[PDB]
Write an enzyme that holds these catalytic residues in place. Structure first.
Site, PDB file in Angstrom:
ATOM      1  CD  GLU A 305      -2.564   1.376   2.644  1.00 17.34           C
ATOM      2  OE1 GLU A 305      -1.949   1.111   3.708  1.00 17.34           O
ATOM      3  OE2 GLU A 305      -3.783   1.684   2.631  1.00 17.34           O
ATOM      4  CD1 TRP A 327      -6.202   0.449   0.030  1.00 23.30           C
ATOM      5  CD2 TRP A 327      -7.771   2.042  -0.011  1.00 23.30           C
ATOM      6  NE1 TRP A 327      -5.672   1.574   0.632  1.00 23.30           N
ATOM      7  CE2 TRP A 327      -6.616   2.565   0.628  1.00 23.30           C
ATOM      8  CE3 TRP A 327      -8.896   2.856  -0.148  1.00 23.30           C
ATOM      9  CZ2 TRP A 327      -6.550   3.873   1.106  1.00 23.30           C
ATOM     10  CZ3 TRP A 327      -8.838   4.166   0.340  1.00 23.30           C
ATOM     11  CH2 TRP A 327      -7.669   4.658   0.964  1.00 23.30           C
ATOM     12  CE1 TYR A 353      -4.092   8.962   3.718  1.00 20.41           C
ATOM     13  CE2 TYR A 353      -5.386   7.071   2.925  1.00 20.41           C
ATOM     14  CZ  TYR A 353      -5.036   7.956   3.940  1.00 20.41           C
ATOM     15  OH  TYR A 353      -5.642   7.840   5.156  1.00 20.41           O
ATOM     16  CB  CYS A 413      -8.086   7.455   8.619  1.00 22.07           C
ATOM     17  SG  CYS A 413      -9.710   6.684   8.449  1.00 22.07           S
ATOM     18  NE  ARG A 433     -11.194  11.299   8.311  1.00 20.69           N
ATOM     19  CZ  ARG A 433     -12.010  10.265   8.424  1.00 20.69           C
ATOM     20  NH1 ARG A 433     -12.815  10.124   9.476  1.00 20.69           N
ATOM     21  NH2 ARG A 433     -12.021   9.347   7.463  1.00 20.69           N
ATOM     22  CG  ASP A 436     -10.643  -0.226  14.142  1.00 21.12           C
ATOM     23  OD1 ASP A 436     -10.653  -0.654  15.321  1.00 21.12           O
ATOM     24  OD2 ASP A 436     -10.944  -0.931  13.153  1.00 21.12           O
TER      25      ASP A 436
HETATM   26  O1  LIG Z   1      -5.970   3.461   7.892  1.00 20.45           O
HETATM   27  C1  LIG Z   1      -7.007   3.406   8.562  1.00 20.45           C
HETATM   28  C2  LIG Z   1      -8.250   3.445   7.932  1.00 20.45           C
HETATM   29  C3  LIG Z   1      -9.400   3.375   8.711  1.00 20.45           C
HETATM   30  N1  LIG Z   1      -9.325   3.293  10.083  1.00 20.45           N
HETATM   31  C4  LIG Z   1     -10.608   3.189  10.802  1.00 20.45           C
HETATM   32  C5  LIG Z   1     -10.990   4.339  11.712  1.00 20.45           C
HETATM   33  C6  LIG Z   1     -12.511   4.232  11.659  1.00 20.45           C
HETATM   34  O2  LIG Z   1     -12.956   3.192  12.516  1.00 20.45           O
HETATM   35  C7  LIG Z   1     -12.781   3.834  10.223  1.00 20.45           C
HETATM   36  C8  LIG Z   1     -12.874   5.037   9.289  1.00 20.45           C
HETATM   37  O3  LIG Z   1     -14.226   5.354   9.055  1.00 20.45           O
HETATM   38  P1  LIG Z   1     -14.730   6.862   9.240  1.00 20.45           P
HETATM   39  O4  LIG Z   1     -13.978   7.443  10.407  1.00 20.45           O
HETATM   40  O5  LIG Z   1     -14.494   7.608   7.943  1.00 20.45           O
HETATM   41  O6  LIG Z   1     -16.219   6.870   9.541  1.00 20.45           O
HETATM   42  O7  LIG Z   1     -11.650   3.083   9.840  1.00 20.45           O
HETATM   43  C9  LIG Z   1      -8.084   3.242  10.733  1.00 20.45           C
HETATM   44  O8  LIG Z   1      -7.969   3.135  11.975  1.00 20.45           O
HETATM   45  N2  LIG Z   1      -6.940   3.308   9.944  1.00 20.45           N
END
Ligand SMILES: O=c1ccn([C@H]2C[C@H](O)[C@@H](COP(=O)(O)O)O2)c(=O)[nH]1
Ligand SMILES: NC(=O)C1=CN([C@@H]2O[C@H](COP(=O)(O)OP(=O)(O)OC[C@H]3O[C@@H](n4cnc5c(N)ncnc54)[C@H](OP(=O)(O)O)[C@@H]3O)[C@@H](O)[C@H]2O)C=CC1
Ligand SMILES: NC(=O)C1=CN([C@@H]2O[C@H](COP(=O)(O)OP(=O)(O)OC[C@H]3O[C@@H](n4cnc5c(N)ncnc54)[C@H](OP(=O)(O)O)[C@@H]3O)[C@@H](O)[C@H]2O)C=CC1
Ligand SMILES: CCc1nc(N)nc(N)c1OCCCOc1ccccc1/C=C1\CCOC1=O
Ligand SMILES: CCc1nc(N)nc(N)c1OCCCOc1ccccc1/C=C1\CCOC1=O
Ligand SMILES: O=c1ccn([C@H]2C[C@H](O)[C@@H](COP(=O)(O)O)O2)c(=O)[nH]1
Lengths: 528, 532
Positions: A305, A327, A353, A413, A433, A436
């Site tokens: 990636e 993805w 990105y 994110c 922002r 998870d």
């Molecule tokens: O690289 C990544 C991509 C996604 N997320 C997680 C955060 C959120 O749980 C979700 C993103 O969804 P939204 O915040 O856009 O709703 O995926 C990550 O932690 N890292």
């Protein structure tokens, strides 16, 4: 009353991995020596640690120890008429020490032997014939603490005779040929109570763990004003540790904080989350690669990636044909239609990105177009700022293009990266922002730690810190049980990352240019 | 040899407000907080958090530590070696001001000083004494943990004059009331502040709590783990006051501690200006907007300009003349002919700052032409979008406002330092993270905290939410070398309890605020400092 508690007898050792999906446990670190000497050439930091532990003494605490020992021996004085520790060694061990370090400085040197005689030694250095004569000598000596320094025979007999109150165990995270080993530690007999920071010394990582045998009112006043379905026994092992200095606890403490104090909120999936807002973690890339060890993680996909980003690609099929499915769900027909991207081809992820890093501001048409020299090449710009204006405060790489958000399969994110250069060293902050914690964040730390290495190498700099700023930080409810398991696992010393030194340009990296070394990890956890 | 207050653990505890005298360019000192009572009762109706604190302090005992206290007092007296309680001492007027349902004060041994009243005049379980010397006698006969003097002013004054007070637990009530009795002026040579608490709001006033002082296996293991702890030319006594404090919990220490860290451990670097800096990388500060407005108190700050700057942002303006005509000069140096020419912006009119914050907030992605153009419905109005996200999708993790438009950076008089704001909603409360790529700790950061704290209030109000936390993330955080001596002075000042910010409640749209809709109240501050 126990002898090891009365006479404060401890063991201190240093164990490597031994030349044999491999499974890991504490017994992975068991290599003590080879052909009468240490398995390794030199690991200075452990040497400095070993000396620091076996020489340290606290005068103001000796009277309590002296009082306790005399009471146990039915005496009023140690007599029976400069405080230092005692250090106990085997003969082979004492023979492996080079001459100019014997006797060990500021320590009462004791040698367990059945063939040596004290006449050809001094009177400072004692010789004793069996284990029992040690307890006799300790009861006649003034000393702070007693450290069993090995070797393999000495450790075994002291361990089976229950004469060890604590084990000061250095984990040397590298593999050597060894012919002698530390005896396996019975986890019903001892348990880990403290784990140190992770360090690099002489081209290996290592950490330090401790096994244990199984005014001030003003503070109270300022606390005069001081939740979720989580129970005490859930985090028994996690809460039983005293010192949790391993950097992996930065991640684990945040999960614990969200579970205990997080806000219950709903999410699109309908799973629901616990969330909090605003955290920092800091990882010292000069000392370790922070690949989580409390579960198994794989890196090929996230490296691909990152290479895909650097190429500036937006075509999801490139990843899919390499079986990188990060993805895939974001490029389905249904997902794109739900984004109102009705005229977007499946797996055409839009100006995400890679497009923003290489073509910020260019008009996006489709994933097959030729964008060469279109928009701002941010990635080239920051690499040039790092080389040519390293004290700039404008060295940022931003993926959050407000104009293109709705055309992306989903908004980024990882909002931005900012870099910082000092004394030939590169640090990187990444602002995320949406975090998870259970599934995404472990991979995210690895991605941007690798990226920091890549940027550092192509700029002739050393990586220093990766700094991870978390915005909306959340734990999905269906991860809670898996994270309870994970929080009660004790981290292993981190691996290291090796880049092919020949690569000197950001675009020349390939998958074979990356090697994770000495990755010791607990078993994989399906987050669910 | 040993002092009486030391043997018998005699403390004072009090709460003082500000007193009507007020003026513009008012000077403030510790004596600013001196109001104790009015007409024989308290000057304020009710400040419950102080009541809770006063009760916790004067009821708390630690049984484990009594045996040492008992021995200490026995040795002093030439003596041989229910639940433990504290002693509380009140003047007669103070006792009469407490409502009967609270008397005698619960879980405490009550002592009243009086001459006009004797024990026969009291129904309650209390000791009457008619001389201070009799308290000491009584303390020698009782079993008790600590002795707290509760006032009033006469009792305070004579116990200070007799040098019988070991520590003063002093609540600073940051509001003004009519008063007729006053805590004595404290001698800096006799007592010094050793601890300062967090700032709180209770009953529509802020307050904090300060303390004046009279002028094993795992223990060794901790030493072991520090075995590898081994800079800048800064002297010890340069931070004498700052390092004397034991507990520094006032939220202003998040800022002050960062300055100290950069001075002690910062990296010496050159910078775009040529002044040179000490710098570090990556900090977070958190301010609880529900409990105070974090306008720094260790030096004087003004808010009229940064409010006008913020209103100018929200209007989407890029015309520096608009601020200059309000005698706000924040952006004047970035709009001169010489500055714009050095930015290679040769075709830019003076004070036309280009596509900077306001333009990005209301028109991101639109082509900038000049500061007079009509941009309506051009570009993305991200300010409107995030207000709509906060109202209609409050759990979104995409509520983000971004000034760093990579395509426009070179057209800006200078790139933004405040990269982005992210918002968070829970339980009807709004929090805000602002990411700052570049942070002038001496001059810029104090104003930046205030600006985004005000903006969080404005966004909260127009979304019918309550403001919770302003969270400030610092990237390149630096102290300019020409600021170091100014900051050495400032770090040795003790913060005051923070002021409060109030908004016109009628304003219900983000675009409808004017300068007169903002009121900062009860700002108590040290002297303004020229950073030089
Ligand atoms: O690289 C990544 C991509 C996604 N997320 C997680 C955060 C959120 O749980 C979700 C993103 O969804 P939204 O915040 O856009 O709703 O995926 C990550 O932690 N890292
Ligand atoms: N990595 C680490 O933490 C450490 C590693 N080492 C390594 O360990 C290896 C040596 O360990 P090992 O080979 O087991 O030899 P040891 O160090 O265990 O010493 C063994 C010898 O000590 C004497 N001895 C042992 N037990 C007794 C007893 N109960 N009563 C009397 N004498 C006793 C005997 O000498 P006699 O023949 O006189 O009975 C025996 O041969 C070396 O390679 C050394 O480098 C050593 C120390 C620390
Ligand atoms: N904000 C705060 O923290 C506090 C506020 N207050 C306020 O303070 C005010 C009262 O304080 P003040 O007016 O100074 O009166 P005090 O509460 O200080 O009590 C004064 C009286 O106590 C008795 N007394 C004092 N010293 C002695 C002594 N050495 N020997 C014998 N008797 C003694 C006399 O009572 P007699 O006339 O019977 O001889 C004297 O008139 C009130 O408004 C009250 O609400 C009270 C406590 C704390
Ligand atoms: C590996 C160090 C170590 N580490 C931990 N954690 N536990 C130990 N039991 C331990 O061995 C110490 C006894 C053996 O020591 C030596 C053995 C071989 C060669 C040199 C030395 C000691 C030296 C050399 C320089 O200064 C010394 O003291
Ligand atoms: C303002 C309280 C206070 N605050 C600090 N920091 N120091 C003090 N010396 C103090 O005064 C306490 C004695 C007088 O107290 C009262 C006075 C008037 C009305 C009620 C009370 C006491 C009550 C009511 C609830 O329960 C009580 O005890
Ligand atoms: O709101 C602001 C604007 C500017 N600065 C400071 C940070 C830097 O010292 C300088 C900006 O210079 P560069 O980072 O762009 O070089 O102004 C702030 O602290 N806050």
């Amino acid at each position: 009353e126990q002898v090891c508690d009365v006479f404060d007898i401890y063991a201190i050792c240093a164990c490597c991995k031994v030349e044999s999906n491999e499974v890991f446990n504490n017994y992975t670190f068991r290599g003590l020596g080879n052909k009468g000497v240490l398995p390794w050439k030199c690991i200075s930091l452990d040497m400095k640690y070993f000396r620091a532990v076996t020489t340290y003494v606290n005068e103001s605490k000796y009277e309590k120890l002296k009082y306790k020992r005399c009471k146990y021996l039915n005496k009023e004085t140690v007599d029976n008429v400069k405080l230092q520790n005692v250090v106990v060694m085997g003969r082979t061990n004492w023979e492996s020490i080079p001459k100019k370090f014997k006797p060990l400085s500021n320590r009462i040197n004791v040698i367990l032997s059945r063939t040596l005689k004290k006449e050809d030694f001094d009177e400072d250095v004692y010789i004793i014939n069996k284990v029992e004569d040690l307890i006799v000598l300790l009861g006649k000596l003034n000393y702070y603490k007693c450290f069993i320094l090995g070797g393999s025979v000495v450790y075994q007999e002291f361990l089976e005779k229950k004469l060890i109150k604590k084990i000061y165990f250095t984990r040397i995270n590298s593999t050597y040929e060894c012919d002698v080993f530390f005896p396996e530690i019975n986890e019903n007999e001892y348990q880990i109570i403290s784990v140190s920071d992770v360090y690099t010394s002489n081209n290996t990582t290592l950490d330090f763990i401790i096994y244990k045998k199984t005014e001030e009112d003003d503070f109270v006043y300022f606390n005069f004003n001081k939740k979720n379905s989580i129970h005490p026994n859930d985090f028994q092992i996690y809460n039983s540790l005293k010192y949790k200095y391993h950097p992996e606890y930065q991640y684990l403490n945040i999960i614990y904080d969200i579970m205990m104090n997080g806000n219950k909120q709903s999410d699109r999936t309908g799973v629901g989350v616990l969330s909090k807002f605003g955290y920092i973690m800091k990882f010292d890339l000069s000392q370790y690669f922070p690949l989580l060890t409390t579960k198994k993680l794989f890196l090929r996909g996230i490296i691909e990636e990152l290479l895909w980003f650097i190429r500036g690609e937006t075509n999801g099929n490139t990843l899919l044909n390499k079986n990188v499915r990060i993805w895939e769900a974001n490029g389905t027909r249904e997902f794109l239609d739900n984004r109102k991207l009705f005229h977007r081809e499946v797996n055409d992820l839009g100006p995400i990105y890679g497009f923003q890093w290489r073509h910020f501001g260019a008009e996006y048409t489709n994933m097959y177009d030729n964008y060469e020299n279109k928009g701002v090449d941010q990635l080239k710009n920051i690499i040039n700022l790092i080389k040519n204006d390293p004290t700039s405060r404008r060295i940022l790489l931003c993926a959050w293009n407000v104009k293109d958000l709705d055309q992306m399969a989903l908004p980024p994110c990882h909002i931005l990266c900012q870099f910082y250069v000092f004394d030939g060293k590169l640090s990187c902050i990444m602002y995320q922002r949406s975090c998870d914690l259970g599934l995404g964040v472990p991979f995210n730390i690895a991605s941007y730690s690798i990226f920091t290495h890549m940027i550092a190498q192509v700029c002739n700099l050393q990586p220093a810190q990766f700094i991870h700023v978390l915005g909306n930080a959340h734990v999905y409810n269906n991860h809670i049980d898996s994270l309870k398991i994970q929080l009660n696992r004790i981290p292993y010393p981190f691996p290291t990352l090796k880049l092919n030194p020949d690569i000197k340009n950001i675009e020349d990296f390939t998958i074979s240019d990356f090697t994770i070394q000495n990755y010791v990890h607990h078993e994989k956890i399906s987050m669910d």
